[PDB]
Amino acid sequence: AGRAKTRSSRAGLQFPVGRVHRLLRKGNYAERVGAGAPVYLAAVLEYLTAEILELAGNAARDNKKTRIIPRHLQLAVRNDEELNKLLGRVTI
Amino acid sequence: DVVEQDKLIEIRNRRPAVLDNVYIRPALEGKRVPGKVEIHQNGIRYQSPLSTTQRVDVLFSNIRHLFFQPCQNEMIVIIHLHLKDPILFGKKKTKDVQFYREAIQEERRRKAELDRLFKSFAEKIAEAGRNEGIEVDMPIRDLGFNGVPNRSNVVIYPTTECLIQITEPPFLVITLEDVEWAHLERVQFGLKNFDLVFVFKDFTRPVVHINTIPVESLEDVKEFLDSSDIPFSEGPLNLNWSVIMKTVTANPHQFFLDGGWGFLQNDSRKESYAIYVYKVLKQVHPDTGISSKAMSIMNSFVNDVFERIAGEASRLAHYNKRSTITSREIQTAVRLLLPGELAKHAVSEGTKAVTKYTSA
Ligand SMILES: [Cl-]
Ligand SMILES: [Cl-]
Numbered sequence A: 001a002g003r004a005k006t007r008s009s010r011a012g013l014q015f016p017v018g019r020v021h022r023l024l025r026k027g028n029y030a031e032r033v034g035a036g037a038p039v040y041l042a043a044v045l046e047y048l049t050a051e052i053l054e055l056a057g058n059a060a061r062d063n064k065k066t067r068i069i070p071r072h073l074q075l076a077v078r079n080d081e082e083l084n085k086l087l088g089r090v091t092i
Numbered sequence B: 001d002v003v004e005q006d007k008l009i010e011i012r013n014r015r016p017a018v019l020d021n022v023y024i025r026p027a028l029e030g031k032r033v034p035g036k037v038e039i040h041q042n043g044i045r046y047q048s049p050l051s052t053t054q055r056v057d058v059l060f061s062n063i064r065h066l067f068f069q070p071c072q073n074e075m076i077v078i079i080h081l082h083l084k085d086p087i088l089f090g091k092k093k094t095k096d097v098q099f100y101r102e103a104i105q106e107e108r109r110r111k112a113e114l115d116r117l118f119k120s121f122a123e124k125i126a127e128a129g130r131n132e133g134i135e136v137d138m139p140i141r142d143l144g145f146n147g148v149p150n151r152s153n154v155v156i157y158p159t160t161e162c163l164i165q166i167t168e169p170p171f172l173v174i175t176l177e178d179v180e181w182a183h184l185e186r187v188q189f190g191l192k193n194f195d196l197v198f199v200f201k202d203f204t205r206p207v208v209h210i211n212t213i214p215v216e217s218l219e220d221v222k223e224f225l226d227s228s229d230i231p232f233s234e235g236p237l238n239l240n241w242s243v244i245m246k247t248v249t250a251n252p253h254q255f256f257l258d259g260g261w262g263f264l265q266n267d268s269r270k271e272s273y274a275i276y277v278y279k280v281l282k283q284v285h286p287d288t289g290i291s292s293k294a295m296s297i298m299n300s301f302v303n304d305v306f307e308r309i310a311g312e313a314s315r316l317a318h319y320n321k322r323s324t325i326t327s328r329e330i331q332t333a334v335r336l337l338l339p340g341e342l343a344k345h346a347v348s349e350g351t352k353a354v355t356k357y358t359s360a
Helices: A007-011 A017-026 A036-062 A070-078 A081-087 B107-128 B215-227 B241-250 B252-257 B260-264 B274-284 B292-319 B327-337 B340-359
Strands: B018-025 B035-039 B043-047 B055-059 B063-069 B076-089 B092-102 B145-147 B154-158 B162-165 B172-175 B179-185 B193-200 B208-214 B232-234
Touching: A007 A017, A007 A036, A007 B340, A017 A036, A017 B292, A036 A070, A036 A081, A036 B274, A036 B292, A036 B327, A036 B340, A070 A081, A070 B292, A081 B292, A081 B340, B018 B107, B035 B107, B055 B076, B063 B107, B063 B162, B063 B172, B076 B107, B145 B215, B172 B208, B179 B215, B179 B260, B193 B215, B193 B241, B208 B215, B232 B260, B241 B252, B241 B274, B260 B274, B260 B292, B274 B292, B292 B327, B327 B340
Parallel strands: B179 B232
Antiparallel strands: B018 B035, B018 B092, B035 B043, B043 B055, B063 B076, B076 B092, B145 B154, B145 B208, B154 B162, B162 B172, B179 B193, B193 B208
């Protein structure tokens, strides 16, 4: 070893556990934020990001495009019942 | 370790051209006293009067830039040497070496005479180093702007080839030919100031921040970048550069296929998750990129959901008389705020990540 494992890597995540923790503390949501909170929350944000991107990226590829644009996002989210309820309408 | 320099070749036939009564930065070990600079055949020599061993040899071959900054409008006058490869300097190593003399109506002549002296000497150095293509470069004062590279407010001056701050340490020398991209951050209605980030063609080199530049210099900064042929982008957020550069240095080809520096932010307290959104994209669609407008929308989703979940956890904690937000409040908040199928899998992934994290 030469550098210790980050908390994100321990959690198996791409999203930043340390930074999320800091942001939870800087928002003054509570007196203290335990170490478990940012792992869970980062995982959730990572999961949602991946779902949206999967649907959005499929629309791009169906249209023979190599790049995701707002229209694809809009389309993916509106055409999905739950994501539409959660994220609201996407305007472009 | 450093890159070895040839030995200085001395002029002995004659008394060499000398600049007397000058201080050196960075400072050496011992009392702070004036020394002098001598010009020889293959370089120059700073010499302290404390000991014939306390001196510094600098070859013309190792000078990338030679700056002269007058004290017509400053407290000190300066000759500054920026080097290709850094050199051993007592205990430490340095890539810069400068010589200065303090200036302290009647001051008019002393100040201007001080400048004539240093300017001529600077010219003699360039003449002495003509073979190596050395030229006296100077700040362009009418293009100067304020900013914070480190801890204090200072004026950054363009030069013919560079962008510099050499009036106080730590010194700043950006050689424009080395630049890959500039990014302006916290550019939004109605800003008081913004941050300027320089990316280098060498992707392993850390980026350079010039923070807190007054808005009244925004147009001048852009104009300077354009006239220096430096492409740039701008936006409202601060990006996570150390993570970005690591992602890019890995696979730059795919990065530029996917749109390059522009897609991370280009919209002309909110957090940028952009580089992480991209990391996930590279997991789900390795060959698919995302536009800057689309990335901005994804980033807003993430902030929004962060704020909503956290807002509810805070609400839950207070109602349940707990003073600390833990994973339990996040989970409950997720259950309440997300649709069932989406909530089911999110709770599952959050639980799975804590499980893995804690096993370790
Ligand atoms: Cl982390
Ligand atoms: Cl970022």
